[PDB]
Structure 1
Amino acid sequence: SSVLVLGRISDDPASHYEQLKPLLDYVVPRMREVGIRRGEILMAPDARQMSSYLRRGRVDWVSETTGAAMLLEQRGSAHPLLMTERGGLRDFHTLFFVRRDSPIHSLSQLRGHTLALQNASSTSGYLLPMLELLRNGIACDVLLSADDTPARGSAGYLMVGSKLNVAAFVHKHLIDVGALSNVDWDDERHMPPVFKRDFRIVHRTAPVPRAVEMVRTGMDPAVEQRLRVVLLQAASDPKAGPALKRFFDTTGFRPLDPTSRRRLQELSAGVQRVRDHV
């Protein structure tokens, strides 16, 4: 509370630390007038833990994709501060892809087949695709290992963790279908050209806002207000340039508005439905 703690859900804190510290170092001095003297970074392995941190006041501010964000809001532990633009894109969506030699051409043909997902905190790699399956009445049971098989009439999913693993398992004929964001598709660390050329997109979800800054329930309203002001000013401060590049290539922030609120509310309903029916 004299300290501002910035976090995110991370499966790779060694690497994500570097993404957060530069902007935290930019923010902290600019919050002195609301009692902030110092900054810390605290990441969490998953949404549940991060929700616990948030609820207990151990993390103040996270920058997350909107689905994860809604997991946090649903648990009562955080609320939106700013909508976040990353790599010049305000929105993203999930794509389902297969090997081009697969006999799958549509989402409906996932029945009988396996899907690679990421982890439960992933928007584009779990929440969105699972939501999509729910809307289309496509059952998708958790599979225990790559030797496990779906019931006939149903799909099944395997959690492979990383985005590269989704691409790799599908490429290597271990899993029939993969889910990634449309942005991930064009990001060569996640979707290597050597794999991508063997893939076909079979389905696209509707776009949602891509990312959002969340602050914890009970943050002091003056800290909240000033944080918002500081981030809003960052996008056009040259002294914030390198820090924002490191911060998931943040290219913009903007105030919440009735549209983004409505879109987060619809996404939140969808996430809740996924949560309720898994």
Structure 2
Amino acid sequence: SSVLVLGRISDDPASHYEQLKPLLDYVVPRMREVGIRRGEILMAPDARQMSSYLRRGRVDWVSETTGAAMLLEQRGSAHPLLMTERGGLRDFHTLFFVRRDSPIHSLSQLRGHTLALQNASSTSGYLLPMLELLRNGIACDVLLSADDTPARGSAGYLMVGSKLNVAAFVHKHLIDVGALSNVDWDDERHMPPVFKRDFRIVHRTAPVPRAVEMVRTGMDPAVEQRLRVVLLQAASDPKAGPALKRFFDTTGFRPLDPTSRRRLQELSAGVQRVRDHV
């Protein structure tokens, strides 16, 4: 508690370290008056491991998309500090896409077909699309490999890891349907135009808030309130501009308000339902 530890869920810590260190370097000196003297970065491979870090006090603060953030809240390990705006957008949503020449035109026609998802900690690439399928009564069994096939009447899903893989697998006719966020859709690292032109969007989910700053269970209340004040004033500090760009292009932070609290409550119910029935 003389150290502030920032992290995130990361399948690529070599790359993501640089996203975190600049804002941490900005924050730490502004926290002296609450006993912080130094900073550290600690990332984890998935929500379950990050949750264990959080609960054990090894990580203090993470910035995550809201579904992942609810996984951490449900596991007893953290709570919301601030709503976060990235790329100028407060919200995002999941889209389902196929090859243009696919016979699939709606979400219901997933029955009989395969779906490329990301990993269990993804909001837009796992939690939201699985929630959507549960709501529509569309069964979706885990498939073991690209040779495996769904039951008739059911869909099936394959975990391919990365967002690009979701695009690549559907493009190359290995899986029928992909799930990515509407923001991922226009991001060329995740959805190359050479694949994108061969795709058609078949369904959109309702939006959720894009991201949230979470802090661990049992953080000292003085540290928590000061971190909040620091981050709230960073967005208008020019001294924080480059750091924020690097921190997932964060363009805003704001207080939790009754609306955002209720939306997180709704999303958390949905995430809990996904976890209970997957």
1: CA distance between counterparts of 2:80 and 2:93?
Answer: 20
Q: How far has the Cα of 1:56 moved from its partner? A: 0.1
Root-mean-square deviation (CA, aligned residues, Å) is: 0.2
Task: For residue 86 of structure 1, report the CA deviation from its aligned partner.
Answer: 0.1
Q: Report how far residue 32 of structure 1 moved.
A: 0.2
Distance in 1, matches of 2:232 and 2:103, equals 48
**Displacement after TM superposition at 1:249 (Å):** 0.1
Distance 2:268 2:257 in 1: 16
Separation in 2, partners of 1:186, 1:223 = 37
The percentage of aligned residue pairs carrying the same residue is 100
Q: How does 1:111-190 map to 2 (within 5 A)?
A: 111-190=111-190
Query: 1:110 deviation in Å?
Result: 0.1
Offset at 1:168? Answer: 0.2
How big is the shift at 1:83? 0.1
CA deviation vs aligned residue, 1:32-84 (integer Å, no higher than 9, x gap): 00000000000000000000000000000000000000000000100000000
User: Residue 263 of structure 2 aligns with which residue?
Assistant: 263
SS in 2 for 1:200: strand
- CA deviations 1:204-239 (Å, max 9, x no partner) are 000000000000000000000000000000000000
What displacement does 1:26 show?
A: 0.2
Deviations 1:110-134 (A, max 9, x none): 0000000000000000000000000
Q: Can you give the 5+ residue segments of structure 2 that lack an aligned partner in the other structure? A: none
Structure 2 Cα separation of the partners of residues 273 and 217 of structure 1: 23
> What SS does structure 1 have at the residue aligned with 2:239?
helix
Report how far residue 152 of structure 1 moved.
0.4
Q: CA deviation at 1:270?
A: 0.3
- Size of the alignment, in residue pairs? 278
- State the Cα deviation string for residues 146-178 of structure 1 (Å, max 9, x = none): 000000000000000000000000000000000
Question: For the residues of structure 2 that align with 1:75 and 1:195, how far apart are their CA atoms?
Answer: 38
Q: Does 2:95 match 1:95? A: yes
TM-score normalised per structure 1: 1.00
Which secondary structure does the structure 1 equivalent of 2:59 belong to? Answer: coil
Report deviation, 1:203. Answer: 0.1
TM-score normalised by the chain length of structure 2 = 1.00
In the other structure, the counterpart of 1:52 is: 52
**Inter-partner Cα distance in structure 2 for 1:270 and 1:73:** 13
